[PDB]
Amino acid sequence: DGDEYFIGKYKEKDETLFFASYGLKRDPCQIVLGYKCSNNQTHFVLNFKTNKKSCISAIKLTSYPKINQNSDLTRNLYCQTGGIGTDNCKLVFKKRKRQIAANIEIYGIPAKKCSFKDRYIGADPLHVDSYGLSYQFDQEHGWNLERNNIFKDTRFSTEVFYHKNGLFNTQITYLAEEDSFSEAREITAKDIKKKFSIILPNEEYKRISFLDVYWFQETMRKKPKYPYIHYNGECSNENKTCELVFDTDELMTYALVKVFTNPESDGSRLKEED
Amino acid sequence: CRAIHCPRPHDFENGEYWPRSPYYNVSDEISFHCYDGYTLRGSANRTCQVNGRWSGQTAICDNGAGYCSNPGIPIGTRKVGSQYRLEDSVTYHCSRGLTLRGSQRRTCQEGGSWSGTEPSCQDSFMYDTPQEVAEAFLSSLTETIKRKIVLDPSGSMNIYLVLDGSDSIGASNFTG
Ligand SMILES: *[C@@H]1O[C@H](CO)[C@@H](O[C@@H]2O[C@H](CO)[C@@H](O[C@@H]3O[C@H](CO)[C@@H](O)[C@H](O)[C@@H]3O)[C@H](O)[C@H]2NC(C)=O)[C@H](O)[C@H]1NC(C)=O
Ligand SMILES: *[C@@H]1O[C@H](CO)[C@@H](O[C@@H]2O[C@H](CO)[C@@H](O[C@@H]3O[C@H](CO)[C@@H](O)[C@H](O)[C@@H]3O)[C@H](O)[C@H]2NC(C)=O)[C@H](O)[C@H]1NC(C)=O
Ligand SMILES: *[C@@H]1O[C@H](CO[C@@H]2O[C@H](CO)[C@@H](O[C@@H]3O[C@H](CO)[C@@H](O)[C@H](O)[C@@H]3O)[C@H](O)[C@H]2NC(C)=O)[C@@H](O)[C@H](O)[C@H]1NC(C)=O
Ligand SMILES: *[C@@H]1O[C@H](CO)[C@@H](O)[C@H](O)[C@H]1NC(C)=O
Ligand SMILES: *[C@@H]1O[C@H](CO)[C@@H](O)[C@H](O)[C@H]1NC(C)=O
């Protein structure tokens, strides 16, 4: 069947930037249509770049033969430079002594309507997140829970970091069952800098209760350096517009945010832990 | 005992070598030049020392339009088979006075490589210096990082050290 590694979400109504089969034991590759390689025992790098007015939407690599190893233990594919939403990325994939062949297809969508709000949301986001996994709750306090079937890492206390299908995910802080989803916001590449902030309504029925962040970021190594995302100030009832700043060690490529509102919320959410 | 000369290129396809002589002396240098649209891989400026081999990697001119690449045409060895697709095999063999060490025939693998080692033309006087022998033994046995000998998880390895009691040296209980 093959080992399929995914970056981004596949769309059935789009076109592919290119598609090529690569012999991973070749030294070096064949420069197909003008793209360079770097092949080693432990690494395979494709310095792909396109000459079309479009932005990368997804990447899928199929490795042969199929080897029974879970793909959620570590990360295999990542665009070292650029990534999803750009026109080119330096795609790095780490090989094994058994994998000897690869089949790389890359998809791009027109740069005009270069948005991903139509594929990462789904039909009902109330019970299912972007990962496609259902929400699980606990009866101790009627709130959410934690998932332990994917790749996660922590740096400080009460820090959540998830990585799946090239998606980096975080939740601040926790979500209640009775809350009703309002809407979402997206950030394009042209609106992304080293540091940037957001402004959200926090009045009447738009009282902020829970937020989640999904993004695509670059890596300078197999182990990434997570951005330092921290809330500034207090999202209290007095200040009508709540704000949040982002500090990044590595430049981001895409950003998606979902808004959860509950008028009965007190503006603070933290377990009885120390 | 004859003067040390150096193997003449039996062929250098898709390019030229400068200069061309019936025999090459010690420390003589050749510049390997490719034709147009062929990319060079290996040492262009090659001088062959007293060991009898040219310094550096074998110079190859490749166009990069096949499943696998040109395996090269080593000096003194001549290649039969210009097809570099999959399941295609090429044949290597040496000229008069030269013995082939490597693969008599290399078949392109489904991974994108060739099955076997790169052939070379050798003589009776030629010996491999201990330093490169140790380097190649380490490269084949270990994996560079330092170096390590990895194995399958929950697995071990076995070594079979085999010696010859021939009537050549066999002195003082394998001294050394
Ligand atoms: C096997 O080959 C791969 C490439 O296919 C090697 O990965 C590359 O290794 C080099 C050197 O370690 C990295 O260069 C780095 O560049 C940054 C840029 O500022 C520099 O600051 C660092 O000091 C370093 O020179 C390069 O990024 C890296 N590429 C990838 C995609 O990871 C790998 O090292 C090779 N392994 C060996 C030879 O054992
Ligand atoms: C490469 O090396 C050869 C041999 O070292 C050079 O040949 C030169 O000229 C003759 C022709 O073989 C060599 O042989 C000796 O020459 C003397 C005259 O001095 C003659 O009585 C005999 O024929 C004798 O065998 C000679 O050794 C050598 N010259 C020198 C100074 O050693 C040749 O020129 C070199 N270069 C090339 C491009 O071949
Ligand atoms: C809603 O706003 C809250 C207050 O804004 C922050 O704090 C002060 C006012 O309390 C803002 O003005 C400052 O006032 C100081 C006097 O107390 C001056 O000395 C100072 O120069 C400045 O003018 C200040 O700009 C503003 N930001 C910061 C970083 O202090 C804030 O506390 C809430 O968190 C915010 N609600 C949110 C962000 O959801
Ligand atoms: C090869 O050597 C010649 C002279 O020995 C020199 O002119 C040329 O630049 C060299 N080629 C290289 C270093 O690629
Ligand atoms: C070699 O070994 C044999 C027995 O192992 C011994 O009898 C003999 O003396 C040895 N030869 C030497 C020490 O030169």
If you search the block for the tokens 């101790």, which residue do you land on?
A140
C-alpha B37/C-alpha B83 separation (Å) is 18
Select from B20, B23, B25, B30 the residue to mutate for testing ligand 2; criterion: most ligand atoms less than 8 Å from CB.
B25
Cis peptide leading into residue A173 (ω within 30°):
yes
Cis peptide leading into residue A263 (ω within 30°):
no
Nearest ligand 1 atom to the CA of A41 is 1
DSSP sequence for A142-169: TEE----SSEE--SSTT---EEETTEEE
Instruction: Give kind and range of the element (H or E) at residue A185.
Output: strand A180-187
C-alpha distance from B30 to closest chain A C-alpha (Å): 25
Q: B1: Cβ–Cβ under 8 A, 6 or more apart, which residues? A: none
Q: Which chain A residues are Cβ-neighbours of B67 within 8 angstroms?
A: 23
Give the pair of three-digit tokens for residue A149.
């079937």
E strand residue ranges, B3-161:
15-18, 29-34, 39-41, 45-47, 60-62, 77-80, 89-94, 99-101, 105-107, 120-122, 143-144, 147-148
Cis peptide leading into residue A28 (ω within 30°):
yes
What does chain B come to in residues?
176
C-alpha distance from B134 to closest chain A C-alpha (Å): 20
Report which DSSP code applies to A73. Answer: S
If you search the block for the tokens 């079937």, which residue do you land on?
A149
Ligand having the closest approach to the CA of B5: 2
Q: Which chain B residue's Cα is nearest to A99?
A: B111
Could you tell me which residues are beta bridge partners of residue A60? A6, A105
C-alpha A58/C-alpha A48 separation (Å) is 13
Q: Do B109 and A31 touch (CB under 8 A)?
A: no
Give the pair of three-digit tokens for residue A102.
């690869």
Q: Which chain B residues are Cβ-neighbours of A25 within 8 angstroms?
A: 109, 111-113
Q: Do A23 and B66 touch (CB under 8 A)?
A: no
C-alpha distance from B88 to closest chain A C-alpha (Å): 15
C-alpha A138/C-alpha B70 separation (Å) is 63
Contact between A176 and A262 under an 8 Å Cβ cutoff? The reply is yes
C-alpha B99/C-alpha B79 separation (Å) is 15
Q: B122: Cβ–Cβ under 8 A, 6 or more apart, which residues? A: B98, B99, B100, B101
C-alpha A21/C-alpha B111 separation (Å) is 11
The answer, yes or no, to whether any atom of ligand 4 lies below 6 A from the CB of B40, is no
Pairing of strands A162-164, A167-172: antiparallel
Q: Which chain B residues are Cβ-neighbours of A36 within 8 angstroms?
A: none
Q: A162: Cβ–Cβ under 8 A, 6 or more apart, which residues? A: A131, A147, A150, A151, A152, A168, A169, A170
Which residues of B lie closer than 8 Å to A, measured between beta carbons?
64-69, 109-113, 143
- Resolution in angstroms, to 1 decimal, for this deposition? 3.2
Contact between A169 and A257 under an 8 Å Cβ cutoff? The reply is no
Helix residue spans in chain B (DSSP H): 130-141
Contact between A229 and A247 under an 8 Å Cβ cutoff? The reply is yes
Instruction: Give kind and range of the element (H or E) at residue A22.
Output: strand A15-23
